[PDB]
Design a protein around this ligand. Sequence first.
Ligand SMILES: COc1ccc(-c2nc3ccccc3n2[C@H](C(=O)NC2CCCCC2)C2CCCCC2)c(OC)c1
Lengths: 230, 11
Amino acid sequence: MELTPDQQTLLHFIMDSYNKQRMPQEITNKILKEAFSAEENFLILTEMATNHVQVLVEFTKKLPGFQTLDHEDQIALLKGSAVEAMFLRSAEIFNKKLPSGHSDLLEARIRNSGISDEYITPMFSFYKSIGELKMTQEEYALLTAIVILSPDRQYIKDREAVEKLQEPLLDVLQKLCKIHQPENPQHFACLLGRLTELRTFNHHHAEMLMSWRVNDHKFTPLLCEIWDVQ
Amino acid sequence: DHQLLRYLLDK
Ligand SMILES: COc1ccc(-c2nc3ccccc3n2[C@H](C(=O)NC2CCCCC2)C2CCCCC2)c(OC)c1
């Protein structure tokens, strides 16, 4: 049931890399402090997402065996997972405990950010669903690593090589679910289930951004590569 | 097609 020394090593290594991300408080403090216009909010999103992608590439490069993979497959994994990892990180930030009334203001500020109503409902549905899972930081880190090392991504030439890298992370996550939540034996299945709902955010991500109540949708050259916009 | 991504990966 317990983690082996090799698994404990893997977990702490993944945790240290995951911890290099912009702190959730640095994000919520800005949104909660002042109400910004839809124009200012689009620029905040774009800057946030550019920092997220940069840190995500550095996290991905540290994943055991990632640099042994074929160069084209490395690109396909990063490009295939960037949007999903972004929404998983936003779901983590959204569900962090804040003082009484702060989370309600946060949801209200995100609701009036400039995004269309059509996309608000499924976004908060996912955020609430992941929040009900009461995930630990280790679970978010491993789940992000599992999302990145998905062998079923399009344009992957060597799926087996990706499978070999994802399998020990899946084993570690399963053990943690059994340790953190022995009451809920469905917890691991629930986590893996939430990964299919993450995939739905891919199909209409570009439409989500273009529907923003702003005159000009300016993206950085890095976001254009990752989001297929402009 | 993804030269910035390639660069960040090949740093
Ligand atoms: C595609 O449309 C949207 C809409 C909303 C969000 C979103 N959901 C959030 C939940 C918790 C806190 C922040 C959140 N955000 C934006 C943000 O800053 N997202 C960052 C992206 C990179 C990884 C860290 C989070 C905010 C929303 C309020 C206006 C300013 C942007 C979003 O993030 C995927 C994407």
